[PDB]
Amino acid sequence: MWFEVLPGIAVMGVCLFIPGMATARIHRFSNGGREKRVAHYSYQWYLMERDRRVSGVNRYYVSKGLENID
Amino acid sequence: MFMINVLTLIIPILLAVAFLTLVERKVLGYMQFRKGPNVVGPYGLLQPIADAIKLFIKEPLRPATSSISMFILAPILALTLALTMWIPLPMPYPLINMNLGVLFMLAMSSLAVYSILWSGWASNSKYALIGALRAVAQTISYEVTLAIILLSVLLMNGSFTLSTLIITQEQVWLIFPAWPLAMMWFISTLAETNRAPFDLTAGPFALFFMAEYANIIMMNIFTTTLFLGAFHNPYMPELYTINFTIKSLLLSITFLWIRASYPRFRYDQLMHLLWKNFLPLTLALCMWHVSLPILLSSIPPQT
Amino acid sequence: VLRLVMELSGEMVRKCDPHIGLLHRGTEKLIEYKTYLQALPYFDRLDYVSMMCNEQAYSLAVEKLLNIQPPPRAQWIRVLFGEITRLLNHIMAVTTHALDIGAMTPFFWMFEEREKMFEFYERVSGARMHAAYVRPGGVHQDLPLGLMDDIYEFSKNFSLRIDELEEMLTNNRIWRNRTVDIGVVTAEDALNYGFSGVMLRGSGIQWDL
Amino acid sequence: MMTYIVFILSIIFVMGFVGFSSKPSPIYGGLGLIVSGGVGCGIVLNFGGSFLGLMVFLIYLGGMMVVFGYTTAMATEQYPSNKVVLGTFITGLLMEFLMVYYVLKDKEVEIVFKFNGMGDWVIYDTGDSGFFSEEAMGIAALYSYGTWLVIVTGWSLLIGVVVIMEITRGN
Amino acid sequence: NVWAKEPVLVASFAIAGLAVILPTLSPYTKYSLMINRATPYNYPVPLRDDGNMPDVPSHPQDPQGPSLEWLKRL
Amino acid sequence: SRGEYVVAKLDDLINWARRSSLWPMTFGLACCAVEMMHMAAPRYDMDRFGVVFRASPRQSDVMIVAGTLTNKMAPALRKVYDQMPEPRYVVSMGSCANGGGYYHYSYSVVRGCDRIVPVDIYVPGCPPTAEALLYGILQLQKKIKREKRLRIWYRR
Amino acid sequence: MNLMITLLTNFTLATLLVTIAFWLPQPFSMKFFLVAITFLLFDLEIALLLPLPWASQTTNLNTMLTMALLLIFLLAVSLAYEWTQKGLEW
Amino acid sequence: ELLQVLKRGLQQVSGHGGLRGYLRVLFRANDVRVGTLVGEDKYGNKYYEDNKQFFGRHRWVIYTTEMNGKNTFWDVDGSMVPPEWHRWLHCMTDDP
Amino acid sequence: TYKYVNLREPSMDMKSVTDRAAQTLLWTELIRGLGMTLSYLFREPATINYPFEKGPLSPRFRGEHALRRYPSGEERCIACKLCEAVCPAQAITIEAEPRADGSRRTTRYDIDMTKCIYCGFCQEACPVDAIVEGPNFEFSTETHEELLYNKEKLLNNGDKWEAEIAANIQADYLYR
Ligand code: SF4
Ligand code: SF4
Ligand code: SF4
């Protein structure tokens, strides 16, 4: 029966399962648990620029919360 | 890391296309009363491996060409289109977030029209030129339709990000407020991939082969984002990618399943059918999907 | 396999010369140099899809010339295999029409049923297709005991399967669109062009040999 | 791979215009205009370019050179490079070489102008609060303010349709 | 009548004509325009204080200005 | 001699790659074509052997000459033979085609398809029973298993 | 240049596939033309349509409805003109 | 009820003898239908007849290795049966 | 007697005409065809695993062209030339001689496998059942020289088996 076609679709679906999942893992690895920041407006990009400027490490993910206030 | 991202996209396409070819052979074998290929190893995964490496081995078409550079220049373009269409496709996180991606989809469909036409001119004697010319005609007559329909379904969501699309699919599937528009869209995807029930009756045959099947997987993934699917809780993307893969596979099996059982159309029936029936119906759905979001207080947050 | 030299105004026609004669084999000449019983299989294989009505017509030509009537069981068994042959030629002509019009799968459905029918020829004589088996003078070497019940089985299952063929096609919308408007035949055409059988059944006149 | 990538894509662009202004076979001409349109898309997207440069790509590299290649395929033969074509290609490369050499090692090159010769990071936005990609909202007019403009445009295209059917045997 | 012969065309005309008409009998179009107007892109710019006008409220809690309340209640 | 060892192993891989799929073209003149389509049928398979029945001449691995070759047929048959890639093999199927056959003593018949194209595999029968043809293609595959081209190239 | 990196990688790997596939083994009708021109003109009218989903958030909604219906209506009149007047017949 | 299948569907896997035994006839050519053990034969080869399959899958041979001596673990020919088994295997009878 | 087709009209009643319109605009019996095809998907297909399982036959197949011989006895053929007198492509070639004993026998008994259409006539014409169409049909011969049988090849092929031939004949020597 079609128990013998499910290996074919099984392996090919695993071949389609992989790229988004491994890509999302590389997204999370490229900013250390963060998600890569999307960028569609000038507003978001300027906020990202001041964020990567204030961080000191010139990197927009360290996210520098509440421990440089005073 | 970014070149690792690119190679993790365009390494599994060979796996996907080869195993899609054995899957179409198997599924037709069971729509028909056959089994196999299963003498080539267990169930035949080495069967696409074997015929792929055979077609590489087998001695090429001797030229017999006109402008060697043009003749190499057509299929290189076809395959690099089939690669460069999977960049803005989010399963949950796309490779490149864009301001607009669906117009990029349609643009690369038109470059596929270029592939067909260049291979047809640089091909051969005159009869294949007439055949490829009819093929370009019946391909280009549907990019009116599919662009129209894609426009009228994104007008429900107003923006072009496609991640706003995966947001706005969260409550209902988008098949419910647009079923006839989605139906006609799916028929136009059968037109663009140029399969049965639509006629086309080369070198290198592997490259045209590859572009065909990657075009099919392209349109299926784009459908599966576009009209159905489910939610995505963040910090768990295996969940959405699983449901995405399963729905796209069911749709591609349905695609080949529709291919299995219908005879090919007469050509003037195809053009006649497109113009006189899909074109006024598309205009009807466009004018109603314009005038209805202005009715039901439902205009999207196009940020 | 034919040769077709057509002359067309564009995506339309004007004329067509069917160059036939690719498959000339000299059958009449070879029968003029042989005997009757020896040269029966040439009559078996000039047509090949229908395959036992050719036998039947040659055997009736000789029996009618020779003024000898076969025994009645021979006549009824010959009628049975004429019906199997009629069934077989129409089912293959429908399926090759479907395969060449497109339509991959019903070809293979009905060819599995035809594979049962070639098993029946095998059990009758032994040959797959070109069983001679109909001598002038009636049928030779009658059936082995245990065949008629198999034909009974085939009748039941095949009625079910052909109703499933009309389930698939026939109110197929686009196959109807594909072949309705083409192929008109006037009754004067069906007489003057010398048509035979199914064309006469199809265009007007009630007619059966 | 550096700052003057806008200027370099412009070099390839004008090379493409020379590449089909040398008058080859018109299917090579369709090739030259496709390559030139691709790098023009690159230039305007470097100014960003967010919609209109992706919009031209569908029309010319999506719906116009298709029909030019179609008409090359159905009308003209070109059944077989030459002196004059490639000689003009050589002199066009020479003229661009001369102009860009004088832009490089001097101040400015003047046809009758003063082209202030350096690459263009000037000028650009000073990081403003755009928030809607001003191209997009600009073209998201024409349906409030654009009463007259789109009406005469669509009317012209309708008249184009009836014109085409008349010359190709109206009715 | 001709619904038997060319049916998808008559269906297309029907949905076309109702799409033409239907904003005339519509109790929601004013709601659509209020929604669409009441969403600000630019900065809500203030103004120089007073000819002592009983408008333009000072603390943003004050409901003397034009606010929205049909938003929260659908 | 692991150089020779790599030669033999790679030759096994490429020749198994050739003999694995082997999609044919069915030339199919007469009733031998009907029996070939009966080995295309659901009972005697061809998917199992990677064998895709296909009317394409441009990509033809083997070519199943079956039916009855005639004098009017022959130049068009060899023109079909020419536009074909050079790794190619021929199965002469049928008593008509592999030696003239029942129409041997006749005009307008080339006495077997030996006199046009070379033949690797003869398979007789009238028609060759579909089972027997499938056996003939299996012994074609074993001929492909013994071909030693890369052996000859390395020690050439 | 990030999508130019992607385009470069796809283009180079495609050229590697093709050239390693190649080092290794060794009249006309008017009816063809009218459909293409009808494509072209309806595609340009598509180009005039397609900034529609940009425009639907303004303070002039009735007018936008009216001229959008005018664009699709004019496109429909062109369609029905060549439809009735033997433009696509055989 | 799919748990009722793979419980039974493993009974032709381990009832063969093991998993490398299952791999034997799987990669040999095709079959996993083992379970009847009807009759072996000199020059090695064994003959399995099961009733619950249809007519065309009753009687199947399992070839052995080097009966004439030509490494016929792989590349199994036809006609590697003795003639009385060439009567039984071709469905000309109902008794072995 | 005749039972013809296509004699109706599309019914003008509102239910039937809107049903044909619903099929026109809703793609229905196309999906009915999809349902029938998926029903054939969910059957088990009928293939035979060829190199192991062999497709069924009759006791009266016509194959190998084998010879027979007497019980512990000599060659069954008298060389009575009937098979070459009937052979409808004349592929038999018999040249006969007596030997030193006195019983009339042969010299040259050749079957062309090319011309042999596999009738059965030479089986039926044989008075002593000398030539018998054999049971197995696997010839698959790589060279055209090798498809031309000699009498010694036929005797070896009649002595690679009689038991099949004897069982087939001893079952069905009663029909013919
Ligand atoms: S050998 Fe027999 S089956 Fe084949 S073409 Fe000749 S007559 Fe037909
Ligand atoms: S008919 Fe029989 S005995 Fe007579 S010559 Fe022929 S094979 Fe021999
Ligand atoms: S089967 Fe027919 S062709 Fe063959 S040897 Fe006998 S009589 Fe001659």
PDB file of N, CA, C and O in Angstrom, chain A residues 35-57:
ATOM      1  N   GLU A  35      16.226  38.090  18.475  1.00  0.00           N
ATOM      2  CA  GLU A  35      15.842  38.038  17.081  1.00  0.00           C
ATOM      3  C   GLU A  35      16.518  39.188  16.352  1.00  0.00           C
ATOM      4  O   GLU A  35      16.699  40.265  16.921  1.00  0.00           O
ATOM      5  N   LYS A  36      16.944  38.935  15.116  1.00  0.00           N
ATOM      6  CA  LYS A  36      17.418  40.006  14.253  1.00  0.00           C
ATOM      7  C   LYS A  36      16.321  41.042  14.041  1.00  0.00           C
ATOM      8  O   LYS A  36      15.174  40.697  13.757  1.00  0.00           O
ATOM      9  N   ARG A  37      16.672  42.314  14.213  1.00  0.00           N
ATOM     10  CA  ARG A  37      15.697  43.395  14.153  1.00  0.00           C
ATOM     11  C   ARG A  37      15.293  43.659  12.712  1.00  0.00           C
ATOM     12  O   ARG A  37      16.151  43.871  11.850  1.00  0.00           O
ATOM     13  N   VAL A  38      13.988  43.635  12.455  1.00  0.00           N
ATOM     14  CA  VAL A  38      13.474  44.008  11.145  1.00  0.00           C
ATOM     15  C   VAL A  38      13.560  45.517  10.963  1.00  0.00           C
ATOM     16  O   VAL A  38      13.675  46.289  11.920  1.00  0.00           O
ATOM     17  N   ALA A  39      13.493  45.942   9.704  1.00  0.00           N
ATOM     18  CA  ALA A  39      13.802  47.323   9.355  1.00  0.00           C
ATOM     19  C   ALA A  39      13.038  47.694   8.097  1.00  0.00           C
ATOM     20  O   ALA A  39      13.441  47.318   6.996  1.00  0.00           O
ATOM     21  N   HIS A  40      11.964  48.450   8.257  1.00  0.00           N
ATOM     22  CA  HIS A  40      11.148  48.869   7.131  1.00  0.00           C
ATOM     23  C   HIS A  40      10.936  50.358   7.031  1.00  0.00           C
ATOM     24  O   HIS A  40      10.547  50.828   5.959  1.00  0.00           O
ATOM     25  N   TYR A  41      11.176  51.114   8.088  1.00  0.00           N
ATOM     26  CA  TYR A  41      10.909  52.539   8.125  1.00  0.00           C
ATOM     27  C   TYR A  41      12.191  53.261   8.488  1.00  0.00           C
ATOM     28  O   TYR A  41      13.152  52.652   8.959  1.00  0.00           O
ATOM     29  N   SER A  42      12.207  54.567   8.255  1.00  0.00           N
ATOM     30  CA  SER A  42      13.348  55.354   8.699  1.00  0.00           C
ATOM     31  C   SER A  42      13.381  55.451  10.217  1.00  0.00           C
ATOM     32  O   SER A  42      14.463  55.530  10.809  1.00  0.00           O
ATOM     33  N   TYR A  43      12.206  55.413  10.847  1.00  0.00           N
ATOM     34  CA  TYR A  43      12.091  55.513  12.297  1.00  0.00           C
ATOM     35  C   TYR A  43      12.773  54.346  12.988  1.00  0.00           C
ATOM     36  O   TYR A  43      13.566  54.534  13.921  1.00  0.00           O
ATOM     37  N   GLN A  44      12.481  53.131  12.529  1.00  0.00           N
ATOM     38  CA  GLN A  44      13.064  51.947  13.140  1.00  0.00           C
ATOM     39  C   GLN A  44      14.563  51.899  12.918  1.00  0.00           C
ATOM     40  O   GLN A  44      15.313  51.521  13.821  1.00  0.00           O
ATOM     41  N   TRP A  45      15.019  52.335  11.751  1.00  0.00           N
ATOM     42  CA  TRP A  45      16.444  52.300  11.483  1.00  0.00           C
ATOM     43  C   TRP A  45      17.192  53.332  12.299  1.00  0.00           C
ATOM     44  O   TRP A  45      18.300  53.062  12.765  1.00  0.00           O
ATOM     45  N   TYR A  46      16.616  54.518  12.493  1.00  0.00           N
ATOM     46  CA  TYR A  46      17.312  55.493  13.320  1.00  0.00           C
ATOM     47  C   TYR A  46      17.328  55.064  14.776  1.00  0.00           C
ATOM     48  O   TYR A  46      18.327  55.274  15.478  1.00  0.00           O
ATOM     49  N   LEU A  47      16.240  54.459  15.247  1.00  0.00           N
ATOM     50  CA  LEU A  47      16.227  53.942  16.609  1.00  0.00           C
ATOM     51  C   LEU A  47      17.244  52.819  16.773  1.00  0.00           C
ATOM     52  O   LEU A  47      17.938  52.736  17.792  1.00  0.00           O
ATOM     53  N   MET A  48      17.400  51.997  15.741  1.00  0.00           N
ATOM     54  CA  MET A  48      18.437  50.980  15.747  1.00  0.00           C
ATOM     55  C   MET A  48      19.826  51.596  15.717  1.00  0.00           C
ATOM     56  O   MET A  48      20.751  51.070  16.342  1.00  0.00           O
ATOM     57  N   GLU A  49      19.987  52.720  15.031  1.00  0.00           N
ATOM     58  CA  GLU A  49      21.298  53.345  14.961  1.00  0.00           C
ATOM     59  C   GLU A  49      21.686  53.964  16.293  1.00  0.00           C
ATOM     60  O   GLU A  49      22.834  53.831  16.732  1.00  0.00           O
ATOM     61  N   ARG A  50      20.748  54.632  16.962  1.00  0.00           N
ATOM     62  CA  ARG A  50      21.091  55.189  18.264  1.00  0.00           C
ATOM     63  C   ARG A  50      21.274  54.082  19.282  1.00  0.00           C
ATOM     64  O   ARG A  50      22.072  54.227  20.212  1.00  0.00           O
ATOM     65  N   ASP A  51      20.590  52.957  19.090  1.00  0.00           N
ATOM     66  CA  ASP A  51      20.781  51.832  19.989  1.00  0.00           C
ATOM     67  C   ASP A  51      22.161  51.213  19.812  1.00  0.00           C
ATOM     68  O   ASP A  51      22.834  50.902  20.799  1.00  0.00           O
ATOM     69  N   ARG A  52      22.609  51.032  18.571  1.00  0.00           N
ATOM     70  CA  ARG A  52      23.951  50.501  18.391  1.00  0.00           C
ATOM     71  C   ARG A  52      25.016  51.540  18.689  1.00  0.00           C
ATOM     72  O   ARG A  52      26.178  51.178  18.880  1.00  0.00           O
ATOM     73  N   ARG A  53      24.656  52.817  18.725  1.00  0.00           N
ATOM     74  CA  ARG A  53      25.628  53.820  19.129  1.00  0.00           C
ATOM     75  C   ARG A  53      25.810  53.847  20.638  1.00  0.00           C
ATOM     76  O   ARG A  53      26.940  53.940  21.126  1.00  0.00           O
ATOM     77  N   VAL A  54      24.715  53.776  21.395  1.00  0.00           N
ATOM     78  CA  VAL A  54      24.833  53.887  22.846  1.00  0.00           C
ATOM     79  C   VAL A  54      25.385  52.634  23.491  1.00  0.00           C
ATOM     80  O   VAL A  54      25.791  52.688  24.652  1.00  0.00           O
ATOM     81  N   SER A  55      25.433  51.519  22.771  1.00  0.00           N
ATOM     82  CA  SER A  55      25.775  50.248  23.392  1.00  0.00           C
ATOM     83  C   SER A  55      27.238  50.155  23.798  1.00  0.00           C
ATOM     84  O   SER A  55      27.571  49.363  24.684  1.00  0.00           O
ATOM     85  N   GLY A  56      28.119  50.927  23.173  1.00  0.00           N
ATOM     86  CA  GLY A  56      29.529  50.881  23.470  1.00  0.00           C
ATOM     87  C   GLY A  56      30.288  49.806  22.724  1.00  0.00           C
ATOM     88  O   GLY A  56      31.484  49.969  22.468  1.00  0.00           O
ATOM     89  N   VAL A  57      29.615  48.717  22.351  1.00  0.00           N
ATOM     90  CA  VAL A  57      30.242  47.585  21.684  1.00  0.00           C
ATOM     91  C   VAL A  57      29.899  47.721  20.203  1.00  0.00           C
ATOM     92  O   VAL A  57      30.247  46.860  19.384  1.00  0.00           O
TER      93      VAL A  57
END
